[PDB]
Amino acid sequence: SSTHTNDSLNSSNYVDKLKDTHFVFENDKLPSEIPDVEEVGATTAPLLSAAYFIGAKCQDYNDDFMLCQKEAKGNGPIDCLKEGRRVTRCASGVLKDLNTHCSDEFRLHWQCLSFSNLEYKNCRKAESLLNKCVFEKMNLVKKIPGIPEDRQIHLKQNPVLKPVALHQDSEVAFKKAQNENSI
Amino acid sequence: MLNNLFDFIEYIEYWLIIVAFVASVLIVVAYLTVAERKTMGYMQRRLGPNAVGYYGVLMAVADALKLLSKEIVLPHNGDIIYVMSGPLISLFSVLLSWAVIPFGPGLSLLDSEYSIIYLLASGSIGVFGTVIVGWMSNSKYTVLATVRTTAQLISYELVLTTVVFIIALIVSSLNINVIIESQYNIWYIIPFFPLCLIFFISALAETARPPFDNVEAESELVSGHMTELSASPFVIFFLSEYCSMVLMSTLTAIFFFGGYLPFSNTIHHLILNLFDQHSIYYFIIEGILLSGYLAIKANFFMFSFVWIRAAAPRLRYDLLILFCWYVLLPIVFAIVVFAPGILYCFDALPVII
Amino acid sequence: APLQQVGRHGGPNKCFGEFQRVVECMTNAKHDSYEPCNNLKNDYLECRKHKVERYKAFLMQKHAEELGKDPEEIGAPFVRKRRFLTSKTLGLVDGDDYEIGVEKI
Amino acid sequence: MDLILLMLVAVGLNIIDIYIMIEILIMGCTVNTIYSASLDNDMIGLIYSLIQIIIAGVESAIGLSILVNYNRIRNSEEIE
Amino acid sequence: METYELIDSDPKFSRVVRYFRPSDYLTWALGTIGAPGLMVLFEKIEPAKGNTFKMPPPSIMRIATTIGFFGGFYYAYTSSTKRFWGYSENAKEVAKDRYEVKKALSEKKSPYGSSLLNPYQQDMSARNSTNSQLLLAIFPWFNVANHQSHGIDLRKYYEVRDGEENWNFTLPPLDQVKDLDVAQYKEYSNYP
Amino acid sequence: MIPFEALIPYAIMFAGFCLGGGVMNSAITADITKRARGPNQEIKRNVGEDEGPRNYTKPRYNTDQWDKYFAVRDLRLTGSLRGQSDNAVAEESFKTNSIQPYSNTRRPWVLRRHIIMKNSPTKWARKYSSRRDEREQEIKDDYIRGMGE
Amino acid sequence: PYLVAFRPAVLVFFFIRQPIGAGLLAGGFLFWQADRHFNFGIRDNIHNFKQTILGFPTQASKWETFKQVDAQKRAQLV
Amino acid sequence: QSASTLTKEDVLTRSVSVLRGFEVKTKDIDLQTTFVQDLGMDSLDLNDALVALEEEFDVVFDDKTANEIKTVGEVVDFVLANYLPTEQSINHTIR
Amino acid sequence: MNLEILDLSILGFYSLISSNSFESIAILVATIMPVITELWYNYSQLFALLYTLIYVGAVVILFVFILSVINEKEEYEYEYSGLFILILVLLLDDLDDNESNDNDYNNVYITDYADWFNNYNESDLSVIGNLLFTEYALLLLIISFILLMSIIGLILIVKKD
């Protein structure tokens, strides 16, 4: 989707010229009555790499925040501020645990995603190492809901679609664990 | 200097990327004119151009420079609008069509979910620019050629558009890069071998190449729409026609032979394992490798354009109309119904991913 | 009831909810007349064109001119060129005024 | 300038020039539909725009055939 | 107005044909032979060529029979549809409808049937096909999908009427019947 | 007997494609990686000694609206549309550096300037007849009159 | 996007064939761009004249309504 | 549109002017005025006049009539009976 | 500088002075190109490409009819016009380009707020097809019916047989 909208950056600066777009800032903070919370600082590749561990850790808080939105009946962004702050802290907790427990395995996986158009199918080997490291240290298992456990695509032995280019670091790190862990 | 010099290159870097992109396409187009005569020459048991530059490598340069040093024929100096507007529309159309051709993953100037439509839409403008030459002209051979261009356009436009739509339907996407990456496990030449022939037949008719060279039929209309064109207006039309041959050859390689995907996955990994991925040299080699795969497949179809010219006689355009409307259209519209039925029967309707 | 105001991703768009509440009000059997649904009609039309909201901005701009208030001292800062959404303007710790890359993501 | 019907001078003096005016006039309706649909983020307007384009192309063909046969009627002797 | 009991506000194509009365088949035959017969009558009223009677060619009678065959079915389809809608007397069809629904409910199967369509498409299909028989004379459109928008409440099948005690159907609650809306959205409220 | 002279132009044509691909793959990938190093020029160009190997980011393709929101969100964190950061907590400046595009909603120029395309019964009414704008001005005036109640 | 490619071609050929017609058309085009860029207000005042004479609510008309309400509301408090 | 707008007085008046530009014995030309006697035209002069009168009225004398023409009035009779406006393009009439 | 204003200024000049039928078939193409580009850069790139795909095929068929009907009429004919009356007309026309008189709607800029709820993110053409082939399928099937009528209509008009 590359449709031009009025809510984000468009395709080119000729679109801005025709629309006379002004990129507007607001120097005011959130009002002091609302409690503060530190935002999530991870970018696209780390967040996609950590997506299924944030889901397996913040499932109760994610559902509660979304259920607040449904019960808000239009008054959404105001009535679920407290629930939203829980979601942000829980997601930051997972990213914090990744950088202390599985730092090399985590940074390996999202460096492959950056190398591979952010497609999960291109980085199975680094993902497998990260899944093994996270499960041992945080007891988090990636699960794709709605399907049997043995038909999950990330556990497929012989996938039809495979990356054309191989991430060299992932190949090296996969060999090292093969000869040292699965003797 | 230093810092200002270094970050000025960053300010101009993408323009050089485009200049290198333009230069790369013009080199293939220039040496396709040489390769056609060499290929026809040996098939005809002659040599072809080997006296202009070392082994004939400057023949394309000589043809352009000689034609660029020729007088332009027109009634008045202010009548440039007549015989220059047509060549420019034809050239701008085919050159803009190259904006969506990916030399590698994400290496296209334009990437969008409607790249397929842009490709078909851009080339349709070139058809318009050709007919403008016979703009109430007093040259009867130019006028006779304009009629034949419209007749050929009606023939191939429906078939060529529908064939590309079937390929887009199989992947459920109109992005050219997605279509290439969808051919990892299978090249569409195997499931759609009939469509590859039809696409190439349509390409020959679109480019006015033999056996469909009824527009520029020398034995019939001296030079067709080019009979009154000399010097620069003739180069631009000649340049655009050979640009279209390279484009349609590259599209045949993209729609049916996997685009830039390697012939052998094992060999592709072996070659790339020699270079450290933390060095910029890996990405140079990969760019050469992936474009080489595209170049090899496109070279074969550029060879096939020359090959069919040296083997088959010309077919009258009124027979081409009957061939496209009574034979090709019924077959292609059968496959546009065949293909979704097969996929639904086996629960394999495509999605974008 | 056919779908109206469908967003570009197939779901309801920004103004569907306003339209849906108008239909529910107009078709409710508890209403003697259509007077209760008049405010809901204005809300839906305001969602699309924002004509009253634009009119309020017209008054605020004009009222600020007559009292001599500076437009650049009471408004919101903005940047017109996308290439100059620089890290210094964004407020980053190691910010710079060099242009950002927008050529190819 | 519109109320004095300045558009009547911009239309050429052939029957085909009237056809072009009709196509341009209808194309103005579609551009207005696309503009409103995009601002509202409404796909129903874009479905309407697509319908207008297809239908406007149908009458262009039907009108052309009438003009084609009208010209044939004049060139009717055809002793050749 | 002589209204009757509503059976199905959008009867499925198979149900309409199955519920044809012997007269509906009779009218289907009359339509099929009424078209060749009218071609004979029109010739009898006034010969097409000259002043003497001439039987129309067999090719005309072939296409006429086909036109009458479709016309006879459309008439019979609209005759049977009115009974489902309650516009026409449908006492026999109510008894047959109640037996089939109660039989399916006791088996914990949907009275409407399982569908390949997702919740949106079932709803969309009902929107397209409901009341479409009012224009069946202009262009055809039939309900060939298993949707749940039939304009009826399945609780009315849980009261035994006169002449239904010998059926002895034990009906479970509606939340145990497979492929019904009230027994579909168990875990998520936006997924069946 | 393979004629090598005839195969020479194909070799140059082959090298023509390789020139485009070799430059485009490396020049674009290097620039994306260079601009992902930090928010200023002294970090993008210079290489620290304590830093590890350079990991490269390849060009992106087949994007959607989420990738546009991600690109702007990355810019507010790193100064690049494809910046890299896995910090669990953002900087303080991220809380107040949101970018909101404000644009006009006027009809296309071709609609309101083409000599023929701008003429229709409803366009003349919108442009020359005050009947529509009189009614809609009443709605705006009610907004300020009703403030007191 | 095709107007970006064609515009240099059409403009130069337009000046070659009709230099006086092109200069007059291009000169008027630049003059209005100078009116908008440098806030001469000539096009705005013509627009304000058209609305006044055709009975539309002008910018001054809408501001007069606000001032009439403002004086009415203040006295309602005082 | 596709009908003649000719009167006997105009055709005679235009015929006299076209005949006045030649070398004729008398300038007093009426319907009864003969070509051989009154105006004095030999074989070639007469056919120069006929073609000149053809171009003026956009008519073409048939061979049988032209060889047998005697008087000025015969020409006026011929033009009135045979003149037709030339067909126009498909756009001249309906537009 | 919005250069589309200049393009329409030239197009309006050439529509007033156009004489023959070839110039009219060029005014059409000189109109679709500004439409396609402005749709591409402002509102809808999908419909910018749909315009190119459909209108070009109509343009060439339109052009080929000009060849069969060109009838010598307007090459040798004369027009008077006057350069002063042309430019004055275009100046008065250029003065009023406000198609709408809602000043606030034309002057005050607006924005939209993005949301992350749409995780199934596809193109506008997929949603258009999703609705056109499901909810407005009747509209599609009538359009198919009208296209069939044109096929029969063109034959019964043009074919001598």
Ligand SMILES: CCCCCCCCCCCCCCCCCC(=O)OC[C@H](COP(=O)(O)OCCN)OC(=O)CCCCCCCCCCCCCCCCC
């Ligand atoms: C690659 C660039 C191609 C175009 C470069 C040439 C520039 C010429 C004008 C191009 C279009 C600008 C607007 C013109 C609309 C058509 C009006 C016309 O009749 O063409 C103008 C051309 C000049 O003839 P001229 O002598 O000045 O006037 C007649 C004097 N009795 O009279 C002619 O008949 C010559 C026309 C030649 C064929 C042109 C076909 C149209 C191509 C349009 C493509 C670009 C779309 C328009 C973009 C600019 C919009 C203003």
Ligand SMILES: CCCCCCCCCCCC(=O)OC[C@H](COP(=O)(O)OCC[N+](C)(C)C)OC(=O)CCCCCCCCCCC
């Ligand atoms: C379902 C599977 C589809 C198969 C896919 C391919 C479809 C092709 C259809 C061909 C039919 C045909 O050649 O038609 C022939 C027609 C008209 O011939 P006619 O007047 O009817 O005489 C023939 C009828 N006889 C023999 C029964 C009496 O014109 C031609 O000579 C077309 C010649 C096309 C040659 C183009 C060269 C392409 C080279 C490609 C190199 C890579």
